[PDB]
Structure 1
């Protein structure tokens, strides 16, 4: 009734819950935090739109901002944040801000940022003649295959078939804009087709698993390094520091290997107010409280998470930590996924087409033709609804 309902996601939700207790002590505003896995959160959000009932404050994945702004689900808080000391846009990285601003209006406040980098076993790489991380597509491919030739049940790299960013990150790296100047999708043109060919090459030559082996990171990346390289974000630095003592000083991160460029994705999450909330004032206090820079830095540093706020990267410990150095370097050129309202549907269509390739053995060009037509059909639909 007067309890403030917050929907949060992943491991970061634990930090939000703990900080919500100081909030309630200082304000008397009781808070109830619902934790939703990232793999269910999209369904849950769609349901809340359709029924017009949901939380008061919602953690929003950056890639879903366009969709839910479009759907009328997030409150225009432009007036409230442009004035605040701790929620004004100019504190945050412009890539993070692009995920909150649509048609001159602001629909949330960046809570944390992330980008994806290469994780690698330094000892295993040296064993196959690499004293440094692979720095090119050709190097990554070469090192992976040398690593998978150690033996049966031993690989060189992983491609996560459920990761929305992967195909698109590599596509940009090979010069594909994903969508051309007109918004026409170009997944069936050569830059993207050769991208998918390249990713599939790891699966076909046995350097990347073609199924879920069911191992946690410590069992796959640690020990003798069944999977000795992979791509992920800050949350995995945290995980590996806590769960893989056996490989202390035998792994590192590095910026992504380059093809035409080594651009990564820019993600993370925003805090937003659900447009149908009857506790808008309370929600905004909670947002403001969660944006105090010291409060933020406390949990971000603890978790090796990347701040979306710029002056936070001036902190002595962030500047000098080797994991933050690599993240910070990668973030310089990281770009959000296409900030379009059908992003998730498109990423799930990619997933299906990827699976047809890597598991079904479909032809890449033929599958990309099919995929691109699917995407064109979706975009044309949206345009008819708009015009």
Structure 2
């Protein structure tokens, strides 16, 4: 009797609230499950293996190609063309790219995100930076200077389990990641030099080489143990809600540049699980949640980025300092490679990064290994497409 919705993290709390109003408005009962992002990919895999799971699923954009490849998401092309709230034409092209495969559409953008630099304005001033670092050389320099405040003080965080980080920096140094032929180029100089660059922060003590176990207010607030980092909109919301002691002492900025300062485009879509016996009510739910006023309500409350383009004309999105930075960054933000093995490739990058930063492996050598692993994965997939 109940429409099952799987959602993730902090956003799923807003979705649960909205779903309560949906149930009041339509009479359709809805149970929203809240799944940590850390566990979600495994939970999705289990649902696919068992063909049992939710009716509506919040899908991280980077996993769209995987779960379309697996046949787990319903083709909703005809249905979204005929909604006035879910039509692809309303959304940013980069967001739409995460939903469309071989001419068919498999979800509706729910929110977008991109990654920006968060920095303590007061602490950067004290090391001679009146504005955020704007190049790789400046990020390195400021970070190293901030790390000299003390043995347990740092300058910049590199999250070893953040799928986007290595690949963002790689593209900034001109690596396409995969060349025109689909061949991975992780062992070519642009990428190798990127990973050397990131390792430089570990080697010089300016990025922590273990998880310090601090929440954002404890690491970025107070005396600013970690005084620069990269994140998305959800960290503006977190810091506004949890770090009052640094109100007026931090800001965001666009990413520092190397060749370019491109960031990632991510977020989440709403999709219908292929095996659902509630497809009609799933679509009603998605249409309702795509109402522009329903969207803007929760988006602005959480400082989140709409994937719907006309939302950006809203006075807050044009004039709020955080939204100005996100909007600027979004102009050039690109999805991670939209390939069905992305997550597994990212996890492989993670292992290789750990061999380097913790194991002391030579970067070129480890990138040769990693690139071979990736090529092997791609061949393994190709073979499934050639029976």
TM range (shorter): over 0.9
Q: Counterpart of 2:262 in 1: which secondary structure?
A: coil
- 1:357 corresponds in structure 2 to 356
Q: Deviations over 1:234-287 (max 9, x none)?
A: 000000011111111110000000000000000000000000000000000000
CA distance in 1, matches of 2:244, 2:16: 28
Shift of 1:10: 0.8
CA distance in 2, matches of 1:22, 1:105: 31
Q: Deviations over 1:168-191 (max 9, x none)?
A: 000000000000000000000000
Q: Counterpart of 1:160 in 2: which secondary structure?
A: coil
CA distance in 2, matches of 1:337, 1:187: 14
Consecutive unaligned residues of structure 1, counting only runs of 5 or more, are: none
Shift of 1:315: 0.5
CA distance in 1, matches of 2:348, 2:246: 37
CA distance in 2, matches of 1:131, 1:317: 26
Shift of 1:385: 3.8
Q: Counterpart of 2:367 in 1: which secondary structure?
A: helix
CA distance in 1, matches of 2:34, 2:329: 29
Is 2:69 the counterpart of 1:61? Answer: no
Q: Counterpart of 1:325 in 2: which secondary structure?
A: helix
- 1:386 corresponds in structure 2 to 386
Q: Deviations over 1:168-218 (max 9, x none)?
A: 000000000000000000000000000000000000000000000011110
CA distance in 2, matches of 1:151, 1:288: 53
Q: Deviations over 1:10-29 (max 9, x none)?
A: 10000000000111111111
CA distance in 2, matches of 1:114, 1:211: 26
Consecutive unaligned residues of structure 2, counting only runs of 5 or more, are: none
CA distance in 2, matches of 1:336, 1:330: 13
CA distance in 1, matches of 2:65, 2:386: 15
The alignment's TM-score, normalised by the length of structure 2, stands at: 0.99
Shift of 1:318: 1.3
Shift of 1:68: 0.3
Shift of 1:79: 0.2
- 2:32 corresponds in structure 1 to 33
CA distance in 2, matches of 1:282, 1:228: 46
Q: Deviations over 1:16-47 (max 9, x none)?
A: 00000111111111001111100110000011
CA distance in 2, matches of 1:275, 1:242: 38
CA distance in 1, matches of 2:238, 2:386: 44
- 2:240 corresponds in structure 1 to 241
CA distance in 2, matches of 1:80, 1:113: 22
CA distance in 1, matches of 2:242, 2:273: 37
Q: Counterpart of 1:33 in 2: which secondary structure?
A: strand
Q: Counterpart of 2:385 in 1: which secondary structure?
A: helix
Shift of 1:151: 1.1
- 1:187 corresponds in structure 2 to 186
- 2:164 corresponds in structure 1 to 165
CA distance in 2, matches of 1:173, 1:361: 24
Shift of 1:107: 0.1
- 2:97 corresponds in structure 1 to 98
CA distance in 2, matches of 1:164, 1:317: 30
CA distance in 1, matches of 2:232, 2:292: 22
CA distance in 2, matches of 1:34, 1:247: 34
Q: Deviations over 1:301-347 (max 9, x none)?
A: 00000000000010011110000000000000000000000000000
CA distance in 2, matches of 1:123, 1:176: 34
CA distance in 2, matches of 1:19, 1:250: 33
Shift of 1:154: 0.5
CA distance in 1, matches of 2:38, 2:21: 29
- Matched length: 386
CA distance in 2, matches of 1:279, 1:380: 37
CA distance in 2, matches of 1:72, 1:244: 43
